[PDB]
RNA sequence: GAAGUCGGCAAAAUGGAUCCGUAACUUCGGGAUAAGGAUUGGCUCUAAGGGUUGGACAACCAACUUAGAACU
RNA sequence: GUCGCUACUACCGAUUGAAUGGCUUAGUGAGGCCUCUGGAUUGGCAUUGCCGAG
RNA sequence: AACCAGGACUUUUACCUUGAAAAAAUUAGAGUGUUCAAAGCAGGCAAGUUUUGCUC
RNA sequence: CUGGUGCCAGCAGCCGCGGUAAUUCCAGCUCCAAUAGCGUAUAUUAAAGUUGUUGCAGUUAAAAAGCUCGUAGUUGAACU
RNA sequence: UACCUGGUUGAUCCUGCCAGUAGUCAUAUGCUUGUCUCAAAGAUUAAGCCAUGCAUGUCUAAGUAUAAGCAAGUACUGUGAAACUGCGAAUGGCUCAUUAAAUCAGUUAUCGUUUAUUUGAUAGUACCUCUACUUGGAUAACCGUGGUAAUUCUAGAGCUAAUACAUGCUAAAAAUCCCGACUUUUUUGGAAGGGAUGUAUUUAUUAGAUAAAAAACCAAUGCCUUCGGGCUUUUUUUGGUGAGUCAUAAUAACUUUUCGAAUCGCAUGGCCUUGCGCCGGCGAUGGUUCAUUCAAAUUUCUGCCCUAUCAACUUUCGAUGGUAGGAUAGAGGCCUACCAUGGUUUUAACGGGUAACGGGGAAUUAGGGUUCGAUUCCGGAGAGGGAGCCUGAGAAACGGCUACCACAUCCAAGGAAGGCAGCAGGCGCGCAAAUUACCCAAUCCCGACACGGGGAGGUAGUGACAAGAAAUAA
């Protein structure tokens, strides 16, 4: 199997280490699960201690969070936008953590309309007072407002698809969003 | 070593679980006291680097043995080599002999390290195949 | 060599058999073996065949059709024994067993007709067990809430003092 | 190696068990339980090599399986049950109660407490923290968990149990002028009073203890067990009471007893 | 597969470039392209290496290389 | 000391040196595992193709 | 302020003393009459009731 | 001490004996050290102050480099 | 037990070596050989090859049952074969081939992780806005029955159970939040009736104050006096370590929504609309989470024979460090993509030999030193050589399996297939090492278990030797 020990590599002095013992189960490795965008497929691989790991081979409809108002919604994935570790992985659309992706912004738009009340890009006195007593913080950044109009939201994944079997993350804003757009603008 | 832009990698460098919003100007800076009497440097308190592998403003913890050595090779990024000098006793001749062993440690940007610069380090879990220590105190040869 | 369902090629092939696969009972749980089994389509190499019949022919076969063999083992589960004889909720199902003679077992007299055991029943023993479980569960809950109230009072007087 | 070991060895057993070098090649190998395997006395050893109520493994198994020996108020049918420090082995058949305490030399001796003074047990709490629903709980040295403790109880405090109704009866803090009995090292089994406490960051802590006969020593924190207050030991200490008479003191005493007695 | 022939005569085989590796001997300069191995298309990309120029930067214009990857 | 003479040792050694075990060189490559298909049969649906296990 | 007492006081040591912590077996060695001994960790009372036990 | 061979047979760890007077060759006798043990071979230790830190030796017995500079290394005047 | 002796020379004093001398579970051998007690015994070479037999099975009153089994109440009522089921099989035992900061020894860390079992706590929560409360389908065993020279080879045919398998309120009262019968001050408005809020995973956010003590305001809005607005011991959460994004709780969502006993045994105890109605103590086996215990896994510092006629080694296809990702139970260049050229070394790096498993320890004994450790204990590796994997908490297991190589093997020439460095025993290499014996009685181990098994272990049998005591006499 895939070995994970340090006994096979050379020492810090450069000398290789002679064989000491055979491969052991408690230091094994497994084939990487290059999950891609598609219909859900989750495998339940047995793990040391009698536990189970959710191997993901294709994921969709992840859970992404909007930190400006502290909300989280189930939004569908589209494709990988930019993977810092390797341009090959984003090119082939493989889902990992810290890999920017595109998600549907419509659930965020409808939630914003139902919460704040005011229209974006334009009776019921209780609804009026609820939507007028929470004003002030209704202003939203233009850099991400453009992507809201474009219908696709840039998001970064924090969960590990190959370990927990889930696709969770949050969308970017501020300097975190600006740095990635600046890096990826010449690329596209 | 040299203060460059903190965004010098292919990814975005940010402190985990540190958030920015509108009601509060940007966000906060997180730091912890490594304990055992070592004080967090003021540069770490008010700085800009990330250094996930740093005893301060990071996630590694100092526990185990605390050692002191002299810098011999600081030609690696955020990592230096220190030399420990000690006398080994040979019972047959009832005498001693010089023995040395090189130790690799990780260094925060809050410390400026050159040749000499007696550094006190503490065990902070393996970092990459050789580095199990982090520099906590510096005795500068110039000050 | 038995022929294995699935192998289209009409020749014996050695494959890694599992516990769930037929023609092999593993010595240890999880033990996988390799054995040679034939294919699916019959040819000129097989020696015996097994047939399943549905309809009867115009002529009457004396060895198969003319001879009938009844069944010996009846239903055991509650649902099976209810559906076998179509008994309602109150129909005295406990007296619906089949009587058999075992006299030649050297019993001599009293021709005992041993009956199979019945599971998934409504015997008072399981009712006693159920009420015991519910009793202890209620006692634990009552003890927990009483301890919560006592500690809340203790915390209230401690912060007061 | 390649799995947990299930066989111990005579010579590899703890020295304080006082097992003969010959007449057997295997040792009891205590089963998992409240106490560590290196700080426990198996029930078979207690009932055979200490009380001598049984002579063989078959005999001790019959005694235990008759449901007569009870530890901490509960009957134990395990042969190699790990009965450690401060355990109340209650023999309800004869009507005797034993409290496992260290001897003058640290070995697990035989102590006999009455029917009263056997329905309680002192536990040194190992850690106190709040668990699920925010409720507080403490874990003790014998692997016991107690919910909803007193807020005054902190780390290294000795609490009193009941063993038939549970709950804390009394608590003793860890500070100066507290009776403590050493449960480890070269002074295990010695009883005295805390005098001075040192402080080490990231390492063990030193506690200085003075006995009743004006002798001062030092020991690690993990070896210190609080047993009561000054002038009032909450347990019945065995003969010797942790004074640690030297070899010369033992010699002249033994000579004094010898003859007519 | 040189058994032909005095004789490998003639012919065949090798061949460019990139990356490994290269012995005896030596006048230390060589032998050496020693010998012996691998790759090479098309398409789509990635990264790095330079010029003037509008208010840490910058939208152009004007440029050729190198290295790597996927697919076929 | 020389040759003469006897048993024995070691080195070099043409013979383009051979052979046992390791280190490599280029190709080939069984078997298990993961992964894409795959569909004897089953499988809820006289009734129909759909989740499918496979 | 400092004057008294208490917590830390090695800049950093080597060196010496002591303490904590740390397998048993082994060795030295304490005690005890395997008839001595190599051994073993047992054992002892009491010579008139043979003692519903005690003591290392 | 006695019979047989006589630089031969042979002993013989070493010296050494054996060319007719053989205390050492092979036979008898006696004694010696050990004793249910004695001997032989090999590996090791003490011997070996012949591996020397304690604790060797270097003019002539084995050994001061042809001389000088000088880095790691070792050693480093007195005083608080 | 601080020790000598012979030998170069005509003779002497030295340097110097040879030989003598004494010890060694230190081995073999020649001669000889009455006892008792006690301990080792195919390690030295061939980690060479093996006929045969055994060495891992296990059931209590308390998991499952018509044997067409047995001594004997018309669901069973006793015993009892086999089978399904749960666990162990990863312990024990043997060998030292490989192995040179590797193993190992002392000493740290896991705030960098897993753990079946044992121990203590932990669990009224799901569903209906018409749900069986005791639930659905096969099957072993059983009855017939075939192929093959053979195997612990099994299909086809008929049935039947679970503490295996696949689903599902058993529990009320009752608070808050979402929808809203209805919405103006009725302080700042929230509620009939409908559901959820248990718990677990993942993501993001927040509270997580306390060495104290005096003030100027803005929005939601708790006690409301006496609406000037006051505005408190306090609701404001709360706890620990040297240190944490630790614990804990809340907020907004997700989940092939993990768990929330469809289970058994012993005692017939009390009553009144008298239905055979409610009801009762002591246990056993499962199952969620945490802690504990038994273990594994990495890991900090120092210490390992000889060799320089080994002086430089590693950097491709990872060598040094950084970033990101994947994989692992978890840290980590363990792996991947990119970025810089780094890391060790005369204090001996690297390479080579080892006739090298390491240590506690053993032999010699003034002190200091020298040699050995295959071997009754601890740790490591292995089951001819590597490689791969299932089950299982735990195996890269070999008295588990798969593939290749070298051996050997029955053969109807189609095929099955095997591993004594486990206990006895056999061949060969050998200077060198024993019975194809008895027993679970003692020690302990495993199991469903007071009872079964254990070539572990104990007991004996043969030997020239390892040790202790004295008979051949007076």
From Swiss-Prot, chain A:
Any one Gene Ontology molecular-function term assigned to this protein's record: structural constituent of ribosome
UniProt-listed GO biological process terms: cytoplasmic translation; cytoplasmic translational elongation; maturation of SSU-rRNA from tricistronic rRNA transcript (SSU-rRNA, 5.8S rRNA, LSU-rRNA)
Compositionally biased intervals (Basic residues): 123-133
UniProt keyword terms in alphabetical order: Cytoplasm, Phosphoprotein, Ribonucleoprotein, Ribosomal protein
PROSITE patterns registered for this protein in UniProt: RIBOSOMAL_S8E
Subcellular localization: Cytoplasm
Sections of the chain in a coiled coil: none
InterPro entries, sorted: Ribosomal_eS8, Ribosomal_eS8_CS, Ribosomal_protein_eS8_euk, Ribosomal_Se8/biogenesis_NSA2
The keyword Flavoprotein is annotated on this UniProt entry: no
UniProt family annotation: Belongs to the eukaryotic ribosomal protein eS8 family.
SUBUNIT field: Component of the small ribosomal subunit (SSU). Mature yeast ribosomes consist of a small (40S) and a large (60S) subunit. The 40S small subunit contains 1 molecule of ribosomal RNA (18S rRNA) and at least 33 different proteins. The large 60S subunit contains 3 rRNA molecules (25S, 5.8S and 5S rRNA) and at least 46 different proteins.
Protein name, as recorded: Small ribosomal subunit protein eS8B
Recorded name of the encoding gene: rps802
From Swiss-Prot, chain B:
MF annotations from Gene Ontology: rRNA binding; structural constituent of ribosome
Principal subcellular localization: cytoplasm
Source species, domain of life: Eukaryota
InterPro entries in the record: NA-bd_OB-fold, Ribosomal_uS17, Ribosomal_uS17_arc/euk, Ribosomal_uS17_CS, Ribosomal_uS17_N
Pfam families according to UniProt: Ribosomal_S17, Ribosomal_S17_N
Subcellular location: Cytoplasm; Nucleus
UniProt keyword terms in alphabetical order: Cytoplasm, Nucleus, Ribonucleoprotein, Ribosomal protein, RNA-binding, rRNA-binding
Annotated Gene Ontology cellular component terms: cytosol; cytosolic small ribosomal subunit; nucleus
PROSITE patterns assigned to the protein according to its UniProt record, in alphabetical order: RIBOSOMAL_S17 (PS00056)
SUPFAM superfamilies documented for this protein: Nucleic acid-binding proteins
One Gene Ontology term from the biological process aspect of the record: ribosome biogenesis
Quaternary structure and partners: Component of the small ribosomal subunit (SSU). Mature yeast ribosomes consist of a small (40S) and a large (60S) subunit. The 40S small subunit contains 1 molecule of ribosomal RNA (18S rRNA) and at least 33 different proteins. The large 60S subunit contains 3 rRNA molecules (25S, 5.8S and 5S rRNA) and at least 46 different proteins.
Any further remark recorded for this protein: There are 2 genes for uS17 in S.pombe.
Family named by the database record: Belongs to the universal ribosomal protein uS17 family.
Protein name: Small ribosomal subunit protein uS17A
Gene name per UniProt: rps1101
Curated annotation (Swiss-Prot), chain C:
Entry keyword annotation includes Cytoplasm: yes
Gene Ontology process terms (BP): cytoplasmic translation; ribosome biogenesis
CC annotations in GO: cytosol; cytosolic small ribosomal subunit
Chief site of localization: cytoplasm
Domain of life: Eukaryota
Keyword terms of this UniProt record: Cytoplasm, Phosphoprotein, Ribonucleoprotein, Ribosomal protein
Localisation: Cytoplasm
GO MF entries: structural constituent of ribosome
Residues the record lists as Phosphoserine modifications: 88
Keyword Signal: no
Job of this protein: Component of the ribosome, a large ribonucleoprotein complex responsible for the synthesis of proteins in the cell. The small ribosomal subunit (SSU) binds messenger RNAs (mRNAs) and translates the encoded message by selecting cognate aminoacyl-transfer RNA (tRNA) molecules. The large subunit (LSU) contains the ribosomal catalytic site termed the peptidyl transferase center (PTC), which catalyzes the formation of peptide bonds, thereby polymerizing the amino acids delivered by tRNAs into a polypeptide chain.
Family: Belongs to the eukaryotic ribosomal protein eS6 family.
Other observations noted: There are 2 genes for eS6 in S.pombe.
Name of this chain's protein: Small ribosomal subunit protein eS6B
Species name: Schizosaccharomyces pombe (strain 972 / ATCC 24843) (Fission yeast)
Annotated gene: rps602
Residue window of the full protein shown: 61 to 221 of 239
From Swiss-Prot, chain D:
Location of Phosphothreonine modifications: 193
SMART domains noted in UniProt: S4
Entry-linked Pfam families: 40S_S4_C, KOW, Ribosomal_S4e, RS4NT
Record localization: Cytoplasm
GO MF annotations, alphabetized: RNA binding; rRNA binding; structural constituent of ribosome
Domain S4 RNA-binding: 41-104
UniProt entry keywords in alphabetical sequence: Cytoplasm, Phosphoprotein, Ribonucleoprotein, Ribosomal protein, RNA-binding, rRNA-binding
Main location: cytoplasm
Family per similarity comment: Belongs to the eukaryotic ribosomal protein eS4 family.
Additional record remark: There are 3 genes for eS4 in S.pombe.
Cited function: Component of the ribosome, a large ribonucleoprotein complex responsible for the synthesis of proteins in the cell. The small ribosomal subunit (SSU) binds messenger RNAs (mRNAs) and translates the encoded message by selecting cognate aminoacyl-transfer RNA (tRNA) molecules. The large subunit (LSU) contains the ribosomal catalytic site termed the peptidyl transferase center (PTC), which catalyzes the formation of peptide bonds, thereby polymerizing the amino acids delivered by tRNAs into a polypeptide chain.
Stored PANTHER family: 30S/40S RIBOSOMAL PROTEIN S4 (PTHR11581), SMALL RIBOSOMAL SUBUNIT PROTEIN ES4 (PTHR11581:SF0)
Quaternary organization: Component of the small ribosomal subunit (SSU). Mature yeast ribosomes consist of a small (40S) and a large (60S) subunit. The 40S small subunit contains 1 molecule of ribosomal RNA (18S rRNA) and at least 33 different proteins. The large 60S subunit contains 3 rRNA molecules (25S, 5.8S and 5S rRNA) and at least 46 different proteins.
């Amino acid at each position: 199997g895939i070995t994970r020990d340090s006994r096979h590599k050379r020492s810090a002095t450069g000398a290789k280490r002679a064989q000491y013992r055979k491969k052991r189960k408690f230091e094994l490795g497994r084939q990487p699960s290059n999950t891609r965008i598609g219909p859900k497929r989750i495998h339940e691989v047995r793990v040391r201690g009698g536990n189970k790991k959710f191997r993901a081979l294709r994921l969709d409809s992840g859970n992404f969070s909007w930190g400006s108002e502290g909300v989280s919604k189930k939004t569908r994935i589209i494709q990988v936008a930019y993977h810092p570790s390797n341009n090959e992985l984003v090119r082939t659309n493989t889902l990992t953590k810290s890999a920017i992706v595109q998600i549907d912004a419509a659930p965020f738009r409808v939630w914003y309309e139902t919460h704040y009340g005011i229209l974006m890009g334009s009776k019921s006195k209780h609804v009026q007072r609820k939507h007028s007593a929470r004003l002030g913080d209704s202003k939203v950044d233009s850099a991400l407002e453009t992507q809201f109009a474009a219908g696709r939201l840039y998001a970064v994944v924090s969960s590990r698809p190959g370990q927990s079997g889930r696709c969770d993350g949050y969308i970017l804003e501020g300097e975190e969003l600006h740095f990635y757009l600046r890096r990826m603008a010449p690329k596209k | 070593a040299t203060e460059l832009v903190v965004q010098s990698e292919r990814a975005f460098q940010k402190q985990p679980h540190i958030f920015q919003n509108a009601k509060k100007g940007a966000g906060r800076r997180w730091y912890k006291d490594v304990g055992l009497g070592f004080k967090t440097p003021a540069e770490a308190i008010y700085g800009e680097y990330v250094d996930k592998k740093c005893p301060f403003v990071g996630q590694v913890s100092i526990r185990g043995r605390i050692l002191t050595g002299t810098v011999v090779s600081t030609k690696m990024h955020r990592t230096i080599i220190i030399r420990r000098e000690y006398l080994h006793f040979i019972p047959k001749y009832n005498r001693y002999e010089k023995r040395h062993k090189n130790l690799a440690a990780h260094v925060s940007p809050a410390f400026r390290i050159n040749e000499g610069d007696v550094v006190t380090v503490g065990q902070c879990r393996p970092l990459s195949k050789t580095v199990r220590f982090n520099v906590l105190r510096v005795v500068k040869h110039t000050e | 060599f038995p022929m294995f369902q699935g192998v289209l090629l009409p020749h014996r092939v050695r494959l890694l058999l599992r516990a769930g696969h037929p023609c092999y009972r593993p010595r240890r749980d999880g033990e996988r073996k390799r054995k040679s089994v034939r294919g699916c389509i019959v040819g000129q190499d097989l020696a015996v065949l097994a047939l399943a019949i549905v309809k009867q022919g115009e002529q009457d076969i004396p060895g198969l059709t003319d001879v009938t063999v009844p069944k010996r083992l009846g239903p055991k589960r509650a649902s099976k024994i209810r559906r076998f004889f179509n008994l309602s909720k109150e129909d005295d199902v406990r007296q619906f067993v089949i009587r058999r003679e075992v006299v030649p077992k050297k019993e001599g007299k009293k021709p005992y007709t041993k009956a199979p055991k019945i599971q998934r029943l409504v015997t008072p023993r399981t009712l006693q067990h159920k009420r015991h479980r519910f009793a202890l569960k209620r006692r634990q809950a009552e003890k927990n809430r009483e301890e919560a109230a006592e500690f809340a009072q203790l915390m209230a007087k401690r912060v007061a003092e | 190696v390649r799995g947990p070991k299930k066989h111990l060895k005579r010579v590899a057993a703890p020295h304080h068990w006082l097992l003969d070098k010959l007449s057997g090649t295997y040792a009891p190998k205590p089963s998992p339980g409240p106490h560590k395997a290196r700080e426990c006395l198996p029930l078979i050893v207690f009932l055979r090599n200490r009380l001598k109520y049984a002579l063989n493994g078959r005999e001790v198994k019959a005694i235990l399986m008759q449901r007569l020996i009870k530890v901490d108020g509960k009957v134990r049918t395990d042969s190699t049950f790990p009965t450690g420090f401060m355990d109340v082995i209650s023999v309800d058949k004869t009507g005797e109660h034993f409290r496992l305490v260290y001897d003058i030399k640290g070995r697990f001796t035989v102590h006999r407490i009455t029917a009263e003074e056997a329905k309680y047990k002192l536990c040194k709490v190992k850690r106190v923290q709040l668990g699920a629903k925010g409720v507080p709980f403490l874990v003790t040295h014998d692997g016991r968990t107690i919910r909803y403790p007193d807020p005054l109880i902190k780390v290294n405090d000795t609490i009193k149990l009941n063993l038939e109704t549970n709950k804390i009866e009394s608590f003793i803090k860890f500070d100066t002028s507290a009776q403590v009995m050493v449960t480890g090292g070269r002074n295990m089994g010695r009883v005295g009073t805390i005098v001075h406490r040192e402080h080490h960051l990231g390492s063990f802590e030193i506690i200085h203890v003075k006995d009743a006969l004006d002798r001062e020593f030092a020991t690690r924190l993990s070896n210190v067990f609080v047993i009561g207050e000054t002038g009032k030991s909450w347990i019945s200490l065995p003969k010797g009471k942790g004074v640690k008479l030297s070899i010369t003191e033992e010699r002249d005493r033994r000579r004094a007893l010898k003859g007519l007695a």
